[PDB]
Amino acid sequence: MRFKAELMNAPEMRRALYRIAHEIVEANKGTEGLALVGIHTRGIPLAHRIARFIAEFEGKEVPVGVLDITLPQVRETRIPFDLTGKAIVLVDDVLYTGRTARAALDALIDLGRPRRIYLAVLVDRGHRELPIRADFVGKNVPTSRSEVVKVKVEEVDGEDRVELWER
Amino acid sequence: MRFKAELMNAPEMRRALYRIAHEIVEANKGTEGLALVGIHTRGIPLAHRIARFIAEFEGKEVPVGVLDITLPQVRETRIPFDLTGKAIVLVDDVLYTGRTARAALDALIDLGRPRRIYLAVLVDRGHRELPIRADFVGKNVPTSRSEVVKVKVEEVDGEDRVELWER
């Protein structure tokens, strides 16, 4: 057994992402100065979806930036806006030790001074090694040190699914 | 009307600090590679006390570093040890927007690579502006934007007390 079990399926993900979308707006009391930044590869597609959903029930569109950072490497950085004074939501597919999130947080701050910075993640598999936490979480997945969470999304993997693996 | 109410008294603080101490050891499964770093002024005295209590029921002594940072200023930085590979516990009196904690976290990482970094605070008054959270909390105090939390400690104020104020 390398593959262990299915943590999420497409419907469950769509549902979670909608909740995230709402929770974000509720938190920012609106769309004012709101912007999303996708990180860790699949965080980008997820950000776009969250933006799609927000506009869908809010009307206005939320800008989506990209900071494809992975651990200390980044494939492409695109932030078409001024981070200063804005309410920025970092979107990550999986929160693990928190080091990736922290690295992203570091990078944002070197680029501007947001009014606030939230952290939204599809799944939080625990095992923090830093005082970082997600403001918004799709699903909490208790894991063991040896297990591994694999997030698959249409835009990148041709399918929406969250898998639990183990070595 | 600036003073509103007493949030904590000496006994309640001692009690909380003891729980913190225990929770810290339980978390690190021992004293191995454990060290505390006091920040934001009154965090220093609190770190020392937490260390005093750990040694009191654990035997071995835990090193206490100082990183007196306040928001971006520091009065004195003393870290008599190598942060690398260690389990470091940042000790703060009050967790507010999380910016002070984040700044401290930034500084630590520029000095070494701890195996882990925990955040321990006497009181968490909410209103985060960053994805930071405390691993250990003496007391959670729901506040309003206008309220202010004042922590008084013997070593610095001649008295142990936590006060709630408002403007």
Ligand SMILES: [Cl-]
């Ligand atoms: Cl992470």
Ligand SMILES: [Cl-]
């Ligand atoms: Cl803070």
